[PDB]
Symmetry: C2
């Protein structure tokens, strides 16, 4: 039901092209648990591509710097989109969104959400109206409809319903212990200290450190940070040497020697784990399926050196970077936690393009900021427990036709949905 090349998420965090998946294989379920592939449907059908609706767009040339907003895929016409639409009722001419049906041009009857209206004489008194809205309100335990519509049928939706309809991506709940295992692979388990502490400092590294030694800036900005870098460095048996600034009276130098900066455990980790790529900084892919607390700590560290926290219309954290490797790696990482992300190519020693990355998520973001030590960056942890939920995204569908499609069908015993490599929740 997908085009050749479509990357899907395997039950182990590995990415795999739809066409190379075999019977017996296990893909990733929205719950972080596996889904077994039992058959591999193949055929030819008109295809449709799904692309997230943007605002600030241009990407479609490999001339570089065109943000590759991961959320998109191509599927065949009969492939079922996993969609949601909010419930809605207006007045008390009470208008509501309700599941209904419509005959398609080819004769088929399709079940779909429809804009419905009921109106009676003002003369007849508001009795019937209030029973309508109250009734509508009792009709469900959710503030949205969760359902599916084959790609070819989306055009049947009326405008209001179509625009309000969105697909979703799921946080990656599955967790690996690669950070842990890399730590074991350099002497290990004897005495406290773990991956969150290293992840934090590595976060600081990407944020504003030097790409040639285990050394980064600090100075002040949030000041309280310093006591933590020493305490954390200390936890990793390293040592933090502070020097004479490293930015017009705003940043410093902190060398993390082995209780150096080269033949060191940290820069080993840096270039060893993948944080330094082609002479440029980058946040690794394993991160996205690692331990959640580790992911949050790496992020807390990154927010601490080069992040901007805001409260105005909800918490939001912003990171600017020129490296596309960092950009792409951060969007993946944040999304795996269940945060909402949007990048923005904007203006900018002298250099061309700069990337602004904003993350939101309420309690999900509060869980990250609570791990920060920077004065204007820390925000109290959530009040209560919280579920990392699927986030929605509005999209545009495009008819393409032609082509061969590749599908995998999961067991009937299961909830026939799994995750593409971009975290989008898809059906068979």
């Amino acid at each position: 039901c997908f085009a050749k090349g479509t990357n899907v998420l395997m039950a182990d965090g590995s990415i795999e092209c739809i066409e190379n998946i075999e019977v017996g294989n296990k893909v990733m379920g929205k719950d972080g648990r596996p889904r077994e592939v039992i058959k591999l449907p193949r055929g030819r059908e008109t295809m449709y591509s799904v692309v997230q609706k943007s605002q600030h767009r241009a990407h479609k040339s490999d001339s570089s710097r065109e943000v590759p907003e991961l959320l998109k895929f191509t599927c065949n016409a009969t492939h079922e989109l996993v969609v949601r639409t909010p419930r809605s009722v207006r007045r008390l001419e009470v208008i509501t969104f309700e599941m209904g049906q419509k005959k398609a041009p080819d004769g088929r009857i399709v079940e779909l959400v429809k804009e419905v209206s009921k109106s009676y004489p003002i003369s007849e008194g508001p009795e019937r109206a209030n029973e309508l809205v109250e009734s509508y309100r009792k009709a469900s335990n959710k503030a949205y409809f969760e359902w599916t519509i084959e790609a070819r049928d989306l055009s049947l939706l009326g405008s209001h319903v179509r625009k309000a309809t969105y697909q979703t991506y799921a946080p990656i709940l599955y967790e690996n212990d690669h950070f842990f295992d890399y730590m074991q692979k350099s002497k290990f388990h004897l005495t406290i200290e773990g991956p969150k502490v290293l992840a934090y400092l590595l976060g600081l590294w990407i944020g504003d450190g030097l790409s040639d030694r285990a050394t980064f800036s600090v100075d002040s900005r949030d000041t309280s940070l310093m006591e933590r870098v020493t305490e954390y460095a200390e936890k990793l048996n390293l040592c933090a040497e502070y020097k004479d600034r490293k930015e017009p009276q705003v940043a410093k130098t902190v060398n993390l020697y082995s209780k150096l900066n080269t033949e060191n455990p940290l820069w080993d980790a840096i270039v060893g784990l993948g944080f330094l790529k082609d002479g440029v900084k980058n946040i690794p892919s394993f991160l996205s399926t690692d331990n959640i607390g580790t992911r949050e700590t790496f992020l807390a560290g990154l927010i601490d050196s080069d992040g901007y926290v805001t409260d105005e219309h909800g918490i939001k954290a912003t990171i600017k970077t020129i490296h596309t490797s960092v950009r792409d790696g951060l969007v993946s990482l944040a999304r795996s936690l269940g945060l909402v992300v949007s990048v923005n190519a904007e203006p900018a020693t002298k250099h061309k393009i700069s990337y602004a990355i904003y993350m939101s998520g309420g309690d999900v973001l509060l869980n990250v900021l609570s791990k920060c030590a920077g004065s204007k960056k820390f925000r109290p942890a959530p009040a209560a427990a919280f579920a990392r939920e699927c986030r929605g995204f509005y999209f545009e569908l495009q008819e393409l036709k032609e082509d061969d499609y590749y599908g995998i069908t999961l067991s009937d015993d299961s909830d026939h949905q799994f995750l593409l490599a971009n975290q989008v929740v898809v059906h068979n």
Copy 2:
């Protein structure tokens, strides 16, 4: 008990200087209900200025071009601030925000919110650890504390708690009906749909209308918005004439002529009559903020449909751009009166040295405005159910000031002892 000149919101939506209030007058309560004044505390005391934390401040006997910070007031040292603090538990050594106590420099023991740590033994298991936490999580239905603290005791707060603590403003639930009354008392127009279509039309005009007649812009690419304008201008007994280009090919000019652009038409008369064109300059009249809610909402939908944009990105949000200082100020107050979160940002462009971008958010509160829009990318369905227009918080800076006279009011023995300042901030007598 505040500084002289502090404007209080009266029970009828009117406004009065605190030194002018008298025993028996009724101020506005946060539920839209009155609160009677029973006493008038006067005195001289050290004063404290409360101002919202923003990049703004603006006018004090000068120009209006800078965006001012309107959320503020000057109270005395002992005045109790109505504040909120979120609840929070961290790690699973556990840290929580809790109601506690502290002793002031004088004798006084003041109950305040405190950050608290809990840690101890190894191997015992997920008992106490995941316990302290789960407990904390069930501890309340509310995700915040609601308490008061005198201005002078604010500095007793820890750093985390202090920065996390904020004040609140309440929507204006109270509704006059000066708009409907204008219409009924005036010109020529049967209602039922009347105040809705008019307010909407006045929204489009404020957004991009000519300052001397009933003409405005409308996106040409938008069929349903053009339909809407026709449909509503018709309900008002007006005839809408579209003209190719009211902006280099993007918008069409719309002329609103009376049926059978200044004289003998409902739109221009209401513009002049209700104060939207205050002596040559556009304005969003104050009455609007204490008027019928549906009307305030429709008017906003009109503005949004005219010179605004909606984004879903990180939460539903609407932005309205205006080059007019008066529209800017009236808009901030109108939006807050509904319970929307609002922020203004000064921006760039013969040309205009500066324009103002005003951002609005507030989940269902905003969705109720948007569902009245006809613009293709503006409209968003009405809420899924009934919602509450809750108070909105704001972080603030407190500064100890001069000793000066103070004017306070005392509300009924046993009542919530809370009322609204003219800027909607929730105050304790």
